[PDB]
Design an enzyme around this catalytic site. Structure first.
Site, PDB file in Angstrom:
ATOM      1  N   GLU A 125       6.301  -3.167   1.439  1.00  0.00           N
ATOM      2  CA  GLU A 125       5.259  -2.784   2.066  1.00  0.00           C
ATOM      3  C   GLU A 125       5.501  -1.714   2.960  1.00  0.00           C
ATOM      4  O   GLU A 125       4.572  -0.579   3.020  1.00  0.00           O
ATOM      5  CB  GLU A 125       4.439  -4.115   2.839  1.00  0.00           C
ATOM      6  CG  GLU A 125       3.826  -5.381   1.843  1.00  0.00           C
ATOM      7  CD  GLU A 125       2.909  -4.578   1.101  1.00  0.00           C
ATOM      8  OE1 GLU A 125       1.876  -4.052   1.716  1.00  0.00           O
ATOM      9  OE2 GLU A 125       2.609  -5.141  -0.181  1.00  0.00           O
ATOM     10  N   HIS A 137       5.635   1.344   0.633  1.00  0.00           N
ATOM     11  CA  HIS A 137       4.344   1.647   0.310  1.00  0.00           C
ATOM     12  C   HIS A 137       3.736   2.749   1.403  1.00  0.00           C
ATOM     13  O   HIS A 137       3.210   3.640   1.249  1.00  0.00           O
ATOM     14  CB  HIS A 137       3.570   0.600   0.055  1.00  0.00           C
ATOM     15  CG  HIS A 137       3.797  -0.291  -1.109  1.00  0.00           C
ATOM     16  ND1 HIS A 137       3.429  -1.578  -1.358  1.00  0.00           N
ATOM     17  CD2 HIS A 137       4.893   0.015  -2.035  1.00  0.00           C
ATOM     18  CE1 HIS A 137       3.782  -1.919  -2.633  1.00  0.00           C
ATOM     19  NE2 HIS A 137       5.022  -0.802  -2.823  1.00  0.00           N
ATOM     20  N   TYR A 151       2.834   7.343   1.487  1.00  0.00           N
ATOM     21  CA  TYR A 151       1.621   8.105   1.732  1.00  0.00           C
ATOM     22  C   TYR A 151       2.174   9.104   2.937  1.00  0.00           C
ATOM     23  O   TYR A 151       1.613  10.375   2.720  1.00  0.00           O
ATOM     24  CB  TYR A 151       0.587   7.343   2.549  1.00  0.00           C
ATOM     25  CG  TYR A 151       0.093   6.287   1.515  1.00  0.00           C
ATOM     26  CD1 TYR A 151      -0.610   6.578   0.486  1.00  0.00           C
ATOM     27  CD2 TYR A 151       0.097   5.001   1.639  1.00  0.00           C
ATOM     28  CE1 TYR A 151      -1.549   5.735  -0.820  1.00  0.00           C
ATOM     29  CE2 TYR A 151      -0.262   4.059   0.898  1.00  0.00           C
ATOM     30  CZ  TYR A 151      -1.049   4.466  -0.519  1.00  0.00           C
ATOM     31  OH  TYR A 151      -1.533   3.767  -1.414  1.00  0.00           O
TER      32      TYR A 151
HETATM   33 MN   LIG Z   1       1.001  -1.888  -0.858  1.00  0.00          MN
HETATM   34 MN   LIG Z   2       1.504  -6.037  -0.963  1.00  0.00          MN
HETATM   35  O   LIG Z   3      -1.103   1.230  -0.596  1.00  0.00           O
END
Ligand SMILES: [Mn+2]
Ligand SMILES: [Mn+2]
Ligand SMILES: [O-]
Ligand SMILES: Cc1cc2nc3c(=O)[nH]c(=O)nc-3n(C[C@H](O)[C@H](O)[C@H](O)COP(=O)(O)O)c2cc1C
Ligand SMILES: [Mn+2]
Ligand SMILES: [Mn+2]
Ligand SMILES: [O-]
Lengths: 132, 283, 284
Positions: B95, B98, B102
């Site tokens: 996470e 992730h 961005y």
């Molecule tokens: Mn994610």
């Molecule tokens: Mn997730």
């Molecule tokens: O995301």
């Protein structure tokens, strides 16, 4: 007849139950043999390697289809999965369809919607009526 | 109390090993996707189209910051097996990956002032802040089964309000490399939602019929509460470009998928989830 | 409330530095081919095999604690949002560390050997004691003491067991297993520095009275953990006669743990002169 596989999560198992068609399950442990012809319903399982052989087919299914007696009576394949897996979406059906002579009948996600159950019932009925 | 050394040679649930293998085998970092090639595509967007994309991306970043920093870790005490705990640490880390990807896209494509305006927007937008308060409330509370429902709804529903945009651009041959990045995220979310939802069902089997019924009511109540709020979030963002009606179809489409992760039947009819096929081809 | 992390404005570049190093050093136990050690492993005594497995199981417990409880318990005490991201990586990599030992066990050892090894970790009072000590502060309230206990774990408690695989490597035995452990030590080194670095930054935000109380705490907790580790070491290494050197290694790493927390070294150089063969195995 229907031959389906489902893991411990049983998303595919619950879909075959909603279908109402009697079907035999490929056991999670051990090998089996079938007598009457069948259509195969299996989920897709990538394993970190990804990039769609390469697997995607449960090992229990590989063992069941490695059986010459079982592979010979295979008629079609319906793959389950989830579109969030990109190109790998239901690629297990692509593998079974390509690595054999059977056609790729249907794809659905997880337990399938009410539209998937109605679609597989009518499609599978007209499919069996064709084999004749 | 006491912790015991994890023995991976005795698994109580083979799914833990399966999920661990897939998630760790899918390890990636934002440096792996070459977003620099999208610089020409990005310049072709309107100031508003750029703004829409940056805000949507900032919204996705918050859901990732929440799920990695609070969500996954809060699931660790409710594990059924020690290996489930190990899997959860991976989710928590990915996470963060992730959320960082961005900032990578922003660094390659956007200016500093554009980025500041995007992050300032996420702080002031009531709908984005509201959905965060809803899941955070259950993450930080008690009731372990409700926490897993809120988490599954986050992984399988809340994200896809924003996942629509990078797929939209890809369908128009724009920001295609960024879409490859986002596709790597969606592939991880699918597994996360599957796993946490799978464990939710395993916990459902351990409770009585009354509790099971109370949780089905809870899931529908929280889904519609989150959905009603997501439609507001969606309208404000996509109304400018006229994509709201299709994003809403995409929303109902994944809401059904989120329900199935929790073992529940699909809720929305076909005529309400028929998202434009160009978006599904990007998936 | 939570705010989306913006990696383009870091309040502390150190978070980005550590994140880059930790993620850049990503590894999984399948990367090290432990199977080549099967001939080497067969040359060990029944006691040498049991000694090696127990030491590894002890490391597995420390990793299970640090990944599922330790790292995650540090997240609420983060100074920057990026520190939180780093902590999630540490939490995951710790699980990888604990998994790699089950990998070694699967390739070299039997099922009965593995069960007996894990059964030992449950009943061993010293191993359970050091776990109880850190878990107490991990689960407690005082965040600065939690970071001290964590650093002592990353920079001190682990190296009681890291000694053995380096010993075998120095004797041309279990070299592939040693390569695995070196990959683990590469992560632990960074963890102890980072958490100790954050501990020092947190020390700057409290008053002199609190800072003095924490220096007293650090020496007192170090004395408790060290006295407990020597018992742990003797029971393990007395059979093979390695205790005197492991104790040297203990003081050697205790100093490193102390310095990670910004405190002065405690044992003199003549008390940390571990056998060079062991130090040479730690370095390429
Ligand atoms: Mn994610
Ligand atoms: Mn997730
Ligand atoms: O995301
Ligand atoms: C580890 C893992 C890997 C998966 N990989 C794929 C995939 O590559 N493609 C796909 O369409 N679905 C993939 N799925 C989704 C499953 O196919 C889907 O959840 C399906 O409903 C599982 O059915 P089952 O419960 O009978 O096992 C994956 C799921 C898991 C847990
Ligand atoms: Mn470790
Ligand atoms: Mn560590
Ligand atoms: O370790």
């Amino acid at each position: 007849s229907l031959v389906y596989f489902s893991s411990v999560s049983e998303n595919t198992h619950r879909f075959v139950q909603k279908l109402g068609i009697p079907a035999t399950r490929i056991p999670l442990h051990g090998r089996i043999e079938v007598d009457e012809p069948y259509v195969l319903i299996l989920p897709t399982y990538g394993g970190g390697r990804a990039n769609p052989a390469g697997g995607y087919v449960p090992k229990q299914v590989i063992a069941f289809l490695n059986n010459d007696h079982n592979r010979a009576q295979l008629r079609g394949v319906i793959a389950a999965g989830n579109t969030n897996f990109g190109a790998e979406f239901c690629y297990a059906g692509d593998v079974v369809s390509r690595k054999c002579s059977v056609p790729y009948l249907y794809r659905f996600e997880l337990m399938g919607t009410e539209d998937d159950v109605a679609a597989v019932r009518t499609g599978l009925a007209e499919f069996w009526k064709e084999q004749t | 109390d006491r912790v015991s050394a994890i023995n991976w040679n005795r698994l109580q649930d083979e799914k833990d090993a399966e999920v661990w293998d897939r998630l760790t085998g899918n390890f990636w970092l934002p440096e792996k996707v070459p977003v620099s090639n999208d610089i020409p595509s990005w310049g072709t967007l309107t100031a508003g189209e750029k703004q829409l994309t940056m805000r949507v991306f900032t919204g996705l970043t918050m859901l990732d910051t929440i799920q990695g920093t609070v969500g996954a870790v809060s699931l660790i005490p409710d594990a059924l097996t020690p290996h489930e705990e190990a899997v959860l640490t991976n989710i928590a880390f990915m996470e963060s990956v992730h959320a960082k990807s961005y900032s990578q896209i922003f660094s390659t494509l956007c200016s500093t002032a554009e980025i500041d305006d995007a992050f300032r927007w996420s702080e002031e937008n009531r709908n984005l802040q509201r959905k965060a308060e809803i899941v955070l409330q259950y993450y930080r509370g008690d009731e372990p089964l409700k926490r897993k429902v809120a988490s599954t709804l986050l992984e399988s529903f809340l994200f896809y309000s924003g996942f629509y945009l990078p797929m939209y651009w890809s369908s128009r041959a724009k920001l295609t490399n960024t879409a490859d990045m986002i596709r790597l995220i969606i592939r991880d979310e699918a597994v996360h939602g599957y796993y946490i939802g799978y464990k939710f069902q395993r916990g459902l089997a351990l409770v009585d019929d009354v509790t099971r019924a109370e949780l089905k009511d809870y899931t529908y109540e929280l889904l519609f509460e989150l959905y009603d709020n997501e439609v507001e979030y969606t309208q404000d963002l996509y109304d400018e470009v006229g994509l709201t009606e299709d994003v809403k179809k995409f929303l109902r489409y994944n809401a059904n998928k989120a329900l199935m992760n929790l073992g529940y039947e699909a809720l929305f009819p076909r005529d309400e989830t028929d998202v434009n096929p160009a978006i599904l081809s990007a998936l």
